[PDB]
Structure 1
Amino acid sequence: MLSVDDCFGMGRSAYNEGDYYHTVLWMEQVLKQLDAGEEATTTKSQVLDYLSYAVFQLGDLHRALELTRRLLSLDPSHERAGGNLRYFEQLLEEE
């Protein structure tokens, strides 16, 4: 396999190409390995930032909201994430 930080780098590479589907595949794998206790410099909040935006681009609306809530729970001063949460809660009438 690839390491947690390698998979994260793969997902960031896909994201910077505008390839949101492959961003999802890689970041989901990161989350799996982080939850398996694997050592990594990458934090969950950083993964959720890419993943929440990518799943929104793919049309997965309530999951984007769920992941944005989880991101803010782990990084409360993340101003961009707070703006995203306001957007998704207004979009989905979940305020």
Structure 2
Amino acid sequence: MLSVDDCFGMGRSAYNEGDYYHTVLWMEQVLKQLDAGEEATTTKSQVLDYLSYAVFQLGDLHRALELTRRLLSLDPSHERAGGNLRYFEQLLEEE
């Protein structure tokens, strides 16, 4: 009985406290519901923005990259996606 937008608010709250582990769980739930077709004012792009960053803070560069690429595909002029993609691709070369 939490709406899509309620779950996004929960994940944003957790993110603002630096709780990236629970940010991921909340944002994955939001994204699941959006990808299933449910209505909301929150956009897929907004979710992928927080999700990719929290995943990165947890240390998963490959998943942060994949999420950032999806974010950019849906939001080419996004404030952060393009710059994060460049940075993440750099970190990939340290492998």
- Runs (4 or more) in structure 1 with deviation over 3 Å come to none
User: Structure 2 CA distance, aligned partners of 1:33 and 1:26?
Assistant: 11
Alpha carbons of structure 1 residues 94 and 37: separation in structure 2 relative to 1, 3 Å:
farther
| TM-score after normalising by structure 1 | 0.94
Alpha carbons of structure 1 residues 90 and 77: separation in structure 2 relative to 1, 3 Å:
same
Give the number of equivalent residue pairs: 95
Post-superposition shift, 1:61? 1.1
User: Structure 1 CA distance, aligned partners of 2:79 and 2:16?
Assistant: 21
Post-superposition shift, 1:31? 0.8
User: Structure 2 CA distance, aligned partners of 1:32 and 1:94?
Assistant: 32
Secondary structure at the residue paired with 1:92?
helix
User: Structure 2 CA distance, aligned partners of 1:79 and 1:39?
Assistant: 24
Q: Output one character per residue of 1:71-93: Cα deviation in whole Å (capped at 9) or x when no partner.
A: 11011011421110000011113
User: Structure 2 CA distance, aligned partners of 1:35 and 1:52?
Assistant: 16
User: Structure 2 CA distance, aligned partners of 1:26 and 1:82?
Assistant: 24
Percent identity between the aligned chains? 100
* Structure 2: gaps spanning 5 or more residues: none
User: Structure 2 CA distance, aligned partners of 1:94 and 1:73?
Assistant: 25
| TM-score after normalising by structure 2 | 0.94
Alpha carbons of structure 1 residues 94 and 35: separation in structure 2 relative to 1, 3 Å:
farther
Q: Output one character per residue of 1:31-72: Cα deviation in whole Å (capped at 9) or x when no partner.
A: 111122111000000000000000000011100000000111
